[PDB]
């Protein structure tokens, strides 16, 4: 029932993702000269490293709001893919189910915990 315990959980999951080979293409925000028409397809853009400096700055209240902005890593690389057999966009799904399976945990016990803590 550790209400932060979230925190450095989200930090050590996000030292896996960045050792993990398949966060090559999302460890920094995509290059506009690499890609230039990125953001007339991609509204938000979204990174692990910009994931890390929000979470690292305190800006992350729950992990609800972390796991939000990594999805939306995995939904712009999804709706920037020209097929669903790119390198990239193979290495998202993968990267994703990683992570799914392991923040499930996290989400889990943070909500026990604040369930717990109005109880
Ligand atoms: C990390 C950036 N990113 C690349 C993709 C896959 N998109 C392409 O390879 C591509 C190239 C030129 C025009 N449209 C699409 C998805 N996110």
């Known amino acids: ?6 925190k450095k959980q989200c930090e050590e999951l996000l030292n896996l993702i960045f050792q ?12 506009l000269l690499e890609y230039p028409d990125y953001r007339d397809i991609i509204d938000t853009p979204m990174d692990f490293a ?4 929000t979470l690292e700055a305190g800006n992350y209240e ?3 709001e972390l796991c939000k902005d990594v999805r939306l890593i995995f939904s712009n690389s999804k709706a920037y ?11 998202s799904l993968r990267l994703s ?8 945990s996290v989400l889990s016990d ?9 109880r």
């Open 81 to 91: 893919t020209p097929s669903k057999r790119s390198r990239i966009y193979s290495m």
């Open 97 to 104: 189910a990683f992570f799914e399976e392991h923040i499930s």
């Open 20 to 31: 993990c080979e398949d966060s090559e293409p999302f460890r920094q925000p995509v290059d």
């Open 62 to 64: 729950s992990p609800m």
């Open 50 to 53: 910009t994931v890390r400096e």
């Open 1 to 6: 029932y550790d209400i932060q315990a979230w």
């Open 110 to 118: 943070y909500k026990s915990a604040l369930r717990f803590h109005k």
